[PDB]
Design a protein around this nucleic acid. Structure first.
Ligand SMILES: [Mg+2]
Ligand SMILES: [Mg+2]
Ligand SMILES: [Mg+2]
Ligand SMILES: [Mg+2]
Ligand SMILES: [Mg+2]
Ligand SMILES: [Mg+2]
Ligand SMILES: [Mg+2]
Ligand SMILES: [Mg+2]
Ligand SMILES: [Mg+2]
Ligand SMILES: [Mg+2]
Ligand SMILES: [Mg+2]
Ligand SMILES: [Mg+2]
Ligand SMILES: [Mg+2]
Ligand SMILES: [Mg+2]
Ligand SMILES: [Mg+2]
Ligand SMILES: [Mg+2]
Ligand SMILES: [Mg+2]
Ligand SMILES: [Zn+2]
Lengths: 60, 83, 127, 152, 99, 116
RNA sequence: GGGGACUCGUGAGAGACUGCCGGGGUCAACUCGGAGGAAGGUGGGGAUGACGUCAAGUCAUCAUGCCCCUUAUGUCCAGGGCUUCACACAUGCUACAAUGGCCGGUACAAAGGGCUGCGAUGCCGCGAGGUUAAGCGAAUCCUUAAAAGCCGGUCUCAGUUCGGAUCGGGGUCUGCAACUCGACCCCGUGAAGUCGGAGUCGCUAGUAAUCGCAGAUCAGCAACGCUGCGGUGAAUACGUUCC
């Protein structure tokens, strides 16, 4: 989103409940999986590129 | 804060302004910006121009608005009857 | 050497321990009436034993796990059928034609994205 | 469908009453997956009918279904500027299914309290040939016979 | 006695069994009581993502994260074999855990 | 018979008849019956004036009845109206007060669809 | 303890590929039926989306050519709002009851989650919840009680022992802060609604139908959304003229 908001999130916040989790690749504040820390779209692209140990396509 | 384990929720920077005046007098119109502070039974006789987004609404407690909140009396939205 | 086979219907597996006996379904402390109040289940179980011959003979006992009432009943039926087949290979045509030997593979259809259930879809509502 | 017929799934015989008929009625009255509840309702109705009559419930049911078995249907068709009904013959299985559905539907919306006595009264009325299912069968038969001219 | 335990876990297939039975199972000559690798159920982590970057909710792709655990043997804490085990190291794709 | 209201629906368990009073429902009737001792499953026609007169004092001892409860309710809402809070303004406009959405709902507080 | 007897778990194979036979078919394709079998013609399902179209969507996942501001169209903070409300639409839930409601007892799952946590028991409280505390990086601990199912009593077709929207009072949890602007618990009050017009939606087998379980986002807000899991569990297809 905005790099200013990225820096504001990354910094130590007063009233710590004001903090939030964003994507580690693009900074998307939504659809961030705490297991990886990336957003949904970035996670899908990373999975397709196969740079996640253990993450691959599922069929069942 | 709506729990019988910590008392009410009153802002410290509000107490240090109301308790330093109620000793001698009921102060005149006052500026406040924290609508979320509870009314302790020390605001009787005083006035509070509580912010509502665009301006400050002066609110006077007589006897009953002790369990209420400062922003309870400040319309945050305005509706005026489409028809 | 006790006779033990594998029997499943939907999700339940029963480990038969068929031995010679008089015949009374031991299902871990609960009798046939105690466990299964359904006449359909009480016939489905003991169907393989009375399908040909004979006629209310040696009992079985199998552990219980998974599924529901009908699934457990079917698993027990298949287990008794396979145990009878193993004990006596002569009546193999009987149960084989009766269809008590088939596993009957039938599992719940997995839910698919975009549909409110496995096959039920949301309302179309064109335009 | 277009690619030929589809075989119909088989049924089992009830240990209490060794006939596919009773299982058919249980299947027809079954709703929300409560096969045990449908069996309970049908058994209560059958026991009530036996209490009121004395003869065998399966025999009473057979008399009822023979009385309420229809002959022709009134399936409609459209050709040009008007639509008219075409009376055609009915197979025994389809006739039995239609009669059972009619009996169950008319027992569902009767003026009694529970489906035990409701279905007992319905099956008794069908056995005596004077019930709602019998009336519906007569209406269908006569209204189809009134369209005998268009029998193509 | 039966003190030393292994909690080998790998995120990939065909490497866990090899790096167990050809590295840890080298202590059969060293003289450690081996029970053999015990195949525990595979873990399965299920996550769902939307294929499109915008507004197409019905396009979803699913992924599975499998983790395989085995080799929970109770091999004896003989000094020679335990020193050999701590000196040898397995590839990072499999995680070793000495209990 | 009448204590405050009719309290006597014909052929009804008094457990549910007590719910017909303004101040007692299922749980209040159950706790009252638990305290008193009289069984729940009994037809109201079989109840006797002695049981009525032991029941009459219990309700007024701690609970409350028709009239004064609604007087307290109306006094509360009227005070809320005159003090002029957000909830009081919502009550004055007839709109629901507990933060419920007003775009497509609140048909109970308002009337049915006006269709102007 | 003892055991690999058994499931089971997870590594490797066999098997189901018209394999074999009968009739037919240009003898070929293939069609129809049989024995053995877990399954018969693709055993069932998932992933798998051709040339291209809609100047389809995304300049707000990200990135990018041209223009636009640089005491501002950059940035921060404190409140408000993104949640309004004469109305209409779309998607889900609830009912309108006796296949039922309540009271007591009672049996059977899968798949998941867990050191900013799962809180086994014990105590307080009708209750949600609070307290001290063991085990648990987990097939050994928690979740964990499954609900539908079964039994005995009550209610007796009633706007009801159906219905839980609204309202008053009283508490709990997270959050510095819950009127806007959260969830849950207790009492009382207890609306419409009695099967829904023309019209319209989904569904062929473990399908529809019904009842519960788990995850992800998150301090709290998801037992009405999403994604998966399991139990019980049907009726119809004669036929392709007709939309
Ligand atoms: Mg957060
Ligand atoms: Mg299901
Ligand atoms: Mg649409
Ligand atoms: Mg292909
Ligand atoms: Mg365009
Ligand atoms: Mg666009
Ligand atoms: Mg961009
Ligand atoms: Mg919005
Ligand atoms: Mg919804
Ligand atoms: Mg109720
Ligand atoms: Mg109960
Ligand atoms: Mg307690
Ligand atoms: Mg009625
Ligand atoms: Mg009405
Ligand atoms: Mg109600
Ligand atoms: Mg209609
Ligand atoms: Mg959550
Ligand atoms: Zn991203």
């Amino acid at each position: 989103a905005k790099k200013a908001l990225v820096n504001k999130a990354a910094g130590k916040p007063r009233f710590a409940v004001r903090a939030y989790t964003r994507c580690s690749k693009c900074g998307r504040p939504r659809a961030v999986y705490r297991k990886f820390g990336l957003c949904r779209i970035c996670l899908r692209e990373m999975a397709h590129a196969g740079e996640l140990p253990g993450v691959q396509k599922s069929s069942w | 804060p709506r729990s019988l384990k910590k008392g009410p929720f009153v802002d410290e920077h509000l107490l240090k302004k109301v308790d330093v005046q109620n000793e001698k007098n009921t102060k005149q119109v006052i500026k406040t910006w924290s609508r979320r502070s509870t009314i302790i039974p020390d605001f009787i006789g005083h006035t509070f121009a509580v912010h509502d987004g665009r301006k400050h609404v002066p609110v006077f407690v007589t006897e009953s608005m002790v369990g209420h909140k400062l922003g309870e009396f400040a319309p945050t939205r305005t509706f005026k009857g489409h028809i | 050497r006790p006779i033990q086979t594998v029997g499943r219907r939907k999700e339940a597996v029963v480990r038969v321990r068929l031995v010679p006996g008089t015949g009374k379904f031991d299902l871990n402390g609960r009798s046939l009436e105690d466990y299964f109040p359904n006449k359909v289940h009480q016939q489905l179980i003991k169907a393989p034993l009375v399908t040909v011959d004979r006629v209310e003979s040696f009992d079985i006992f199998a552990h219980l796990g998974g599924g529901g009432p009908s699934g457990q009943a079917g698993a027990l039926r298949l287990g008794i059928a396979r145990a009878l087949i193993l004990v006596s290979p002569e009546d193999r045509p009987a149960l084989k034609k009766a269809g008590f030997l088939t596993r009957d593979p039938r599992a719940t259809e997995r839910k698919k994205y975009g549909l409110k259930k496995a096959r039920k879809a949301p309302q179309y509502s064109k335009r | 469908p277009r690619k030929g017929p589809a075989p119909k799934r088989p049924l089992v015989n009830d240990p209490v009453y060794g006939s596919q008929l009773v299982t058919q009625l249980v299947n027809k009255v079954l709703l929300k997956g409560k096969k045990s509840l449908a069996e309970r309702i049908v058994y209560g109705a059958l026991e009530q009918a036996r209490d009121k009559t004395g003869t065998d419930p399966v025999i009473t049911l057979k008399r009822a279904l023979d009385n309420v078995k229809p002959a022709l249907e009134v399936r409609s068709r459209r050709v040009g500027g008007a639509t008219y009904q075409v009376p055609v013959e009915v197979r025994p299985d389809r006739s039995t299914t239609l009669a059972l559905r009619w009996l169950v539907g008319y027992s569902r919306q009767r003026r009694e309290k529970t489906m035990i006595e409701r279905l007992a009264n319905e099956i008794l009325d069908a056995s005596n040939g004077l019930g709602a299912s019998v009336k519906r069968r007569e209406d269908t038969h006569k209204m189809a016979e009134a369209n005998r001219a268009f029998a193509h | 006695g039966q003190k030393i335990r292994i909690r080998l876990k790998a995120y990939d297939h065909e490497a866990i069994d090899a790096s167990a039975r050809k590295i840890v199972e080298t202590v059969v000559r060293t003289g450690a009581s081996v029970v053999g690798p015990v195949p525990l159920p595979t873990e399965k982590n299920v996550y769902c993502v939307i294929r499109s970057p915008h507004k197409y909710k019905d396009s979803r792709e699913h992924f599975e994260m499998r983790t395989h655990k085995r080799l929970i043997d109770i091999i004896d804490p003989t000094p020679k074999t335990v020193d050999a085990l701590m000196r040898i190291d397995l590839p990072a794709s499999v995680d070793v855990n000495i209990q | 018979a009448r204590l405050v209201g009719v309290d006597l629906p014909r052929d009804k368990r008094m457990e549910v008849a007590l719910t017909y009073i303004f101040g007692i429902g299922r749980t209040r009737s159950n706790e009252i019956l638990a305290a008193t001792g009289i069984d729940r499953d009994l037809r109201t026609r079989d109840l006797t004036e002695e049981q009525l007169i032991h029941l009459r004092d219990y309700i007024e001892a701690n609970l409350k009845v028709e009239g004064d409860l609604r007087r307290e309710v109306q006094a509360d809402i009227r005070r809320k109206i005159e003090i002029g809070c957000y909830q009081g303004l919502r009550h004055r406009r007839g709109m629901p007060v507990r933060g419920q959405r007003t775009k497509t709902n609140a048909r109970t507080r308002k009337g049915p669809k006006r269709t102007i």
